[PDB]
Amino acid sequence: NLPEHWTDMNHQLFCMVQLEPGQSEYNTIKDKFTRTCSSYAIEKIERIQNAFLWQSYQVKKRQMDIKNDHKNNERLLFHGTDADSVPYVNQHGFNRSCNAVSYGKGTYFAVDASYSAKDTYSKPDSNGRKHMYVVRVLTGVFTKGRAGLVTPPPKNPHNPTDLFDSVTNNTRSPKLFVVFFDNQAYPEYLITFTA
Amino acid sequence: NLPEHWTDMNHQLFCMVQLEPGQSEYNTIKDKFTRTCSSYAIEKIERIQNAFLWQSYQVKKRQMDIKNDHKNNERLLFHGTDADSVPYVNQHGFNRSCAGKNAVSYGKGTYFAVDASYSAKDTYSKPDSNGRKHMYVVRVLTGVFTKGRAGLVTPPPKNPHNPTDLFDSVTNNTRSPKLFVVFFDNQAYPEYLITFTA
Ligand SMILES: COc1cc(OCC2CCCCC2)ccc1C(N)=O
């Protein structure tokens, strides 16, 4: 059940599609980035069309929507990474098994592109090129994280297996989320940019 | 997509179903166990009906069947664990982040045994305070595999010049596999829980 805005893949299951500047989709994603990174330079934005990763993500979204008895389990967040990780993320998504892990041993996502834009995350390559994903994240019901978590905490220590979906640095005003399971994040766009 | 011979869970998402000796379903599991663990005695065998784990696993299986262009991707393997881990595995499956270092490490993942005797070691199926030992019977997407190495945190690439095209799992020995290691969530479905004693 592939999304209407994807473009045809001639019966293949993975494509990176460069967006056309000035069309609605490019403009929307560029605006999310420019909200906090207006001083950067965008080289290109690519849509990630990974049928398998999308399928697995959408199954987990449907499950989280049933469990939590609402929609509103998804957020659009940012993830800076090095050029050497991009091929893996495009094909396989985010892997906690692959910086500080102060809020747990998961994959980190920022609310603001400006945070992911730090060189510690979006490491510049030999030509100054930096890479950041725009990511659909199943944040669900979240709690404050802490060092050394391998999964989110339970919602009640009386039922130890009924977990929070994600953790954050601050529940009232989150700036980062950590997820601990495969297929809780779908890399939707890749932004290539410079300082 | 839930299997039609599961018990009706009346809108619930999770159930453990105690099997009856003399049913083919119980006897096939008992035989598979006793082939290498005839010195132990089974207390009970429970079918694990976990709707969400099943759905996610079956998606991964269909994907691996498409990618590998054959349906030889699934093996039925054993996993011994401690009583404290059973509630988590029953609900959430096998988490590599929680896995012990194996005494012979072929990678940092979740380990599954071909022989129940391996999983029956007290190091894995730690006896609880009542002397009960716990072993899962697991559908595992082993797919295409190679010999592992202790440093792996994912399966290795098939081709070093295409680092993202991975083996599905690793083993101790490709000619005579006795263990498999998987490195991704929802690559293993806990199907039965065997409770057993000396
Ligand atoms: C590991 O990568 C990140 C980590 C992020 O917070 C990690 C820090 C935040 C402050 C407190 C200690 C942990 C945010 C974004 C990314 C990212 N790749 O964009």
Curated annotation (Swiss-Prot), chain B:
Cleavable signal peptide: none
Subcellular location: Nucleus
Coiled-coil intervals, chain numbering: none
Documented effect of changing residue 124 to C: Reduces catalytic activity 20-fold. Abolishes activity
Domain PARP catalytic: 2-198
Source superkingdom: Eukaryota
Biological role: Mono-ADP-ribosyltransferase that mediates mono-ADP-ribosylation of target proteins. Acts as a negative regulator of transcription.
Family label: Belongs to the ARTD/PARP family.
Protein name: Protein mono-ADP-ribosyltransferase PARP15
Organism the protein comes from: Homo sapiens (Human)
Gene: PARP15
Full protein segment contained here: 481 to 678 of 678
